[model samples]
Target chain A: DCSFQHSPISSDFAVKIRELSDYLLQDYPVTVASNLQDEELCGGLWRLVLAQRWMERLKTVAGSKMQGLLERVNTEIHFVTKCAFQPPPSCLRFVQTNISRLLQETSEQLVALKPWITRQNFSRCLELQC
Target chain B: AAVEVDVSASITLQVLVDAPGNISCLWVFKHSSLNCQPHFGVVSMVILKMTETQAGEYLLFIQSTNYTILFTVSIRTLRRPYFRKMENQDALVCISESVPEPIVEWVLCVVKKEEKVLHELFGTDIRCCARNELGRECTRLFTIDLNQTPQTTLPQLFLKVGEPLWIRCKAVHVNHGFGLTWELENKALEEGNYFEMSTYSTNRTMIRILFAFVSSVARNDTGYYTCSSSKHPSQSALVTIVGFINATNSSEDYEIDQYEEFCFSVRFKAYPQIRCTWTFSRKSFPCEQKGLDNGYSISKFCNHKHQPGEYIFHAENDDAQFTKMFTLNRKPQVLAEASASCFSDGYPLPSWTWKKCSCTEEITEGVWNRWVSSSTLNMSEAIKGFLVKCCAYNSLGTSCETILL
Candidate 1:
C-alpha cells in the first residue's frame, strides 16, 4: 500500500531493495517479523511496496513484461515475512523442508525479475537524457 | 511416528483396532510384552515410566488374526552446545541431540563479516551448527581463550603389598576430547602384568587405573607413577615398598630338655630378595632358607645341645630382625612356692595335676585357673625340694618339671 509517486527510482535504489529482500528470504529465513527491525525487514516490505508502484509506472511507459514476475516476488515477500514470524510446525520436522523450498523459489523469481529492471532503467535513462 | 515430551512425563498411545468380536491386543517394547486392554473405541497402551531407553521402536499385535502395527518413539531433551578443551589443547564445540544423529560444521566470523569457512579452526570466534534430518540448530558465536589455564588437583596414593590398587584421574569443568595416559617410571604402562585401565564421563571425564594386585610387592615395583592428560600438565606420585618379618615362635624364653633337638622357623616379606642370618650361642651361621609361594622367605634351624643353660637364637635382615633366648634343662622342675604350692609355665598352657607316690593325704587338691593358669599344689610332706614332679600334659606331649630333693 505504500507509494513513491513523487520520488525518482534510481537504478541503485532498485537494486538495493531487491538485494535486501533476497537476503531476508535466503539467509534470515528463520527470523520472525517481531525480531526483525523495521529498518531491516519491515522497511524492506515497504520498499518492496514502493518498488511495485514504480514498476507499475515503468510498465506503462516501457511496456515491460516483468509485472507478473514482480507480482510473484511481492506475494513471496509477504509469505516469507509471515513464515519468519509464524512458521508452520512442519518446517521444523525436516531440514530443507518448507523454508528451504520457499527461499529457493524466491531466489529464482528474483533472478528472473532482474533483467526487466535493467531494461527499464536503460529505457528511462534514454528518455530522461541523463 | 515421532512424539516429543518433557523428561519424567508419561505418554500413552491409543490405537483403534476395528473387530467384530472381543479381540486380544498386546504392546511390545524392547523385546518385552506389555499388558493392554481392548475397548470399544480404541486400544490404549500407557507407559507410566519413560526414560532414555524408552525412546525407540514399538510393535503392536492382535491375537487370532494377522494384524500388526509399527510405532516409533522419539524423546526430546533440550541441550545447548558447549565448548570443551581437550587435554591436548584442542577445543570441541558439539551438540549431539536429534532424531537423526547430527553432524557439526564450524564457521568463523570476524569484524562483522564472515571471514572464511574453517574445517579445523581454534582460538577464534566460531559458530557451530548441528544439522540433521529434523533441522539445523546453530550455536551463538563463541570464542576460546587459549591462555586461560585449567585448575585441577593431583591425586596421591599409598598402598600395601599383596593388596589391590585402584586409582582415578578426573578433569572437572574442562572440555572434552581428553586423552589420559598412565606411566610408571616415565614408561608407558601396558594392559598386561597386573595393570588395567578404563575411562568414563560425567560432569568430568575420568580415567581409572585398575591394578589387579600388587601381587607380592617387591622393591622392583616401587617407582614414580604419572597420570597425564592431553591438554593439562601431568601429575606424578611416589610409591615405596617396605619389608616385614614374622616368626613362628613369639616366646622370649623357651625351656627344652638337654640332648633334645630344638627347632623354630622365621618368615619375612620384603621388596628385594630377603636374606636372613641366624646367630646361636655367639656363633653366627647362615640360616637354611627357601622362597615361599606367597613371595616371602622362610628360614628354619634345629640343633641338639649338651649344655643346660641359656641359648640365644637371632635372625636378622636389612629391613627387619628378631631374637629369642631358650633354656636347656636336664630335668623337668616342679618347685614349691613360699605359699606351699607347685607352679609351672609352658607354651599352649598344658594341664597339670599333682599326686604323691601312693599317698593321698600328703597332697591336697590343687586348683588351676586357665587364665594366668599354673599348677598350685598343696603339699603336707613338703620337705627340701620335696622330690615333687609337676607334669604338664598337652596334645604334643607331656613335659615334667621335677624338683631336686
Candidate 2:
C-alpha cells in the first residue's frame, strides 16, 4: 500500500495522461508538421499545465505524496510550459518530450497515492466522529 | 516499399487480396530503362531470379469491380563500391548502384567527403565503403597511384558576355614529362579566338597555366573549354555567359497544393531588377528579395496561406516585363486519426497512397482532374504506436507527408 497506484482518475484526465504518455513513445514527432506550427506540442504543453494544476490542488490540500514528487514535476511542467511565452529554443521539442515523459511516470506514481489519500479523508471524518 | 537483393539472387513478390470476385491486374516498370516489357496477367505473384538488370520500380495496378489499388515495389541490386577513376581534381570517386544512394567512406584515411571525392590522397593502398538501408559493402586495399595523375584546378566559370574570363588550366607535377595546351569551343586557341595561355609557378604545387581572355568575349565563346597535355590526360571547364532575364514557361498556369512554398528562380541582375507581387483574397503581398543567390538572384514570395484565387506573377525591368497567371487550387489537407485520411494536390491532380506500416488499403478519389485527390483508411481500432505516410503522385512523381500515432 506504500506505492501510489490505486487512483481511478476521471476518463478525461486519463486520456490527457495518455496523450503525454504517447508522445514519448512516438518515433517521428512531426505529426502535424505541415502547418509548420505544431498544435500537438501546444496541446501537450497545455495538458501538462492542466496536470500541474491538478497536482497543485492535490499537494495544497491533501495527497501529501503530491507535495514531494508531483510538486517537483509541476516545477518542470511550469518551467517548460511558460517557455512558450518567451523565445523557445530549438531544443524545445527535445526538452518538452523528455519532461512530458517524466511527468507521465510521476503521474503513475501519484495514481498509487490517491487510494491512500482516500484513507486520509476517512481519518478526517473519523476525527469529526462520523 | 523497397527491397534490395544481390545479383543472381532469386526472390518472389506476392500480393494477397481477399480474392475479389472480378479482378484485373497490370504490371509496369514506370521510370526504369531496364528492359522489362509490360507484364499483363491476373496472377497474384511474380517470381524473379534477381539480376542487375531487374533493379527498378515495379508498379502493379490491380482493379476489382468497384475498386482500384496501385502497389509500388522498388527493387534495388547490391554491389561493391566501384571507382570512377580519378576524375574530379585527382581524387577517388566511389560509385554505387543502389537506391536512395549509399554513403561512401574512404578507409583508413576515414575521410568524410560529402561528394565521395577523396582528394589529396597520395596513398599506396586505399579502400572505400558503401552502404544503403539494406546492407554494407567495402572494397579491399588496392594500391592506387597518385604520382602519375596530373592535378588540374579549374573552377566553374560564370560571366556576362564581353566579361573578362581569366582561369587557370594548371597541371601540377611534370615527373613523367608533359606539354599543356588550351582549346576553346573544341578549337585550338591559336591566333583566332583572341585568348592565350601562359605558364607560371610560384610557391610550388606543380606547373599550372593561366588561360586568360584578355581582350573581348561574346555569346559564341560560351562553351566547354579544356586544357590538355600531350603525354597526359585532359580536363575541361564550362563557362556560363549570363544573358537577359527572360521568364520561361511564364504562360503556363500552375495548380499548387495548399500551404506549400510558391517561389521561382531567375537571372535577376540585376536583369532590369524586376519586382514581382502576389495578389490573392483581396490581399496583396510583395516578393522577398533577401536570401537570394548572387548570380541568378532568385526572389521568393513568402509562403502564405493560399486560397482558391488568382495571382499575377508580374515582374519587369526598364527593358522587359513578364507576367504569368496562377490559379490556386486546394490540395487534400487531411491530418486525421489512425483511422487515417489523406489527400494530394498536384498539377494533374495527384492520386492518394496512404502507407500504414507497409501498404495503404484505401478507396481513393480526387477533387480537382479536376489535381487534388484524397483517400481514407479505416482501421479496426486505433493504431496505438505506429507511423503512417501520406503520398500524392502526379506525372512528375510523388511527394509525401507522415503521420505518427
Candidate 3:
C-alpha cells in the first residue's frame, strides 16, 4: 500500500536514528562473526549491523519525504529486539546496554513519527526493499 | 592480599583444604561486631555475594595439623555516583551520592523554565562531573534553558529553505526578571519541531545573546522574526529563502596574459537554497550551477579568455543586491636604450625609471599622457656600460626591458 512521491523534509526520527546508529558504528562497530565461543553473542552483535543497514535502506528507498519510514521501521524493528541476549562475559555488557537503549530510542522515534508519516508509502517500501 | 569487586557480581572466595583431616577455619570482619559462624568440615570455599555495602576487611584463620595459616583480605568496591535534584522549584538544589563522595559541584547558571513569565533557577545540570577518576559517567547533563540578556542585537542573518536558522537576542539591564519571546511574522512563536528556543546566562556584566532556532526553514519562512523582551527593547531580523553570495575570491585586481590560455573566473561562497551575474564589456555572464567545497558554491567563468577590461559583478537575493568591480589587463610594455629614450604604454598608462644613468621622470605634458609615458636618460662622459635597464610600471605591474645601446 505504501508508494508515492512527495517533497521530503528532514525527519527528526530518521535523523536521530542515523545519529545513534552512527554513534554505535563509530564507537562499538560490529560485524557478524563466529569467532566468539557463544553464537548467541555473535548474533546479538550482528543484529545491530543489519539494523543500521536498515536505516540506510530506509533513507534511500523512503525518499527524503519519508514515504516508507514507518513501514521500514516496522519491518526492521525486530532487529532491535534481537539485539538482546545474555552475553557470557561482563565485558560485553556495555555493548549490550547500548543496544538496549537503542531499542528504547527507536521505539520513541516510531511513536513520534506514527502520525506524521501515514501508512501507505511505507508498505510499498518493504516489498520494494525485500 | 587485596581484591576488587563490583556490586551485583557474584563471586566465590576459596582455599584448598588439602593434606589434613581436622581442618578448622574462622572468618571475621575487622569490626569485631560482625561475625560469621559457618558449619563445615575441611570445606574452605565460600560462595560470597557482593554488594557495595559489603566492602570491608575480613580476617580468616585456618587451623590444621600443626600448620597455622591466616589470611587478611581487603575487598574494594567499585561504584560510580548518582545525581539528586530538588523536588521543590522555589529553591533549586543539586546533589549526588557515591561512597567515595564525588566532588559534585553546582553549575549554577541563570535558568528559565515554562513561558509568559520569567523563571530564575540556581541549578538545572548540577552534577558529579566525573574527574580525577578512571572514567566518567554522566548522570544528567540537563534540561536547561539558560537565557540571559546583556546587550547584544541580532546580526543580519542569511537564511534559506531546508537550512537551520538561529538568532540571539539579549538585554543589558539586570534589575527585573528578563525573558525574551519570539514573534515570527506577526504571531508569537510556539516551540515545536521546526522552531526551538533557548536562553543564555550571565553573572557579572556581560554581553547578552538570545536564541531562536528553526531546524529546517521553509520557503514561506520569509518574514521579520522579532524577539520581544520584558523591560527591554524588542529586536528582529528579516529572514527569507533567498541567500547571499559572498565573494570568496576578493582580489579585485586580476591580470590575464595577453595570450594566456587560462580562463578567468570569479568565485563566490553562495548557496543554491540562490543569481549573481558578472558584466564584462557590456555582456552578462551567469554563475555556474555546480558547487565547490570551502563554500565556493557559485562561480562565474568562461572557457576562453575574457577581454582585458573592468569586470563588474552584482549578486541579488530576494532581500537585497550588491555590486563589486575588478580590473583585468595586459601589463605595461617597456622599450628603452641607454643615453636615449624610454617609451611604455598600457591601460592606465605607465611610469618609467632609468637604471645607471641620469634620467628624467615621465613627460606628463602630452595628449596621450593617460595611455602612454616616456622618459630619457642623458649620457655623460663617465658613462660606460655594457647594457642599461629601464622599467615601466602600470596598474597591472612592472615591465622591465633592457635596450642594448
Candidate order by lDDT, highest to lowest?
2, 3, 1
DockQ of 3: 0.01
Alpha-carbon runs more than 4 Å astray in model 3: A1-130, B1-245, B248-251, B263-272, B304-306, B330-371, B376-405
TM-score of 2: 0.26
lDDT of 2: 0.48
Stretches of candidate 1 above 4 Å error? A1-130, B1-251, B258-262, B271-275, B306-309, B317-322, B326-405
Give TM-scores for every candidate, taking all chains together and pairing residue i with residue i: 0.21, 0.26, 0.27
Q: Order of all candidates by TM-score, from best down to worst?
A: 3, 2, 1
Q: 2 or 3, which is superior by lDDT?
A: 2
Predictions in order: chain A TM-score:
0.24, 0.32, 0.24
* Docking category of candidate 1: incorrect
lDDT (C-alpha) at residue B347 in model 3: 64
Model 3 lDDT per residue over B347-373, tens place: 666777656432432212222233667
- Per prediction, fnat is 0.00, 0.00, 0.00
Q: Rate the local accuracy (lDDT) of all candidates.
A: 0.46, 0.48, 0.46
Error of 1 at B275 (Å): 4.9
The DockQ figures for the candidates are: 0.01, 0.00, 0.01
- For B282-323, candidate 2 gives per-residue lDDT tens digits of 677777654243335665654646555566666665566666
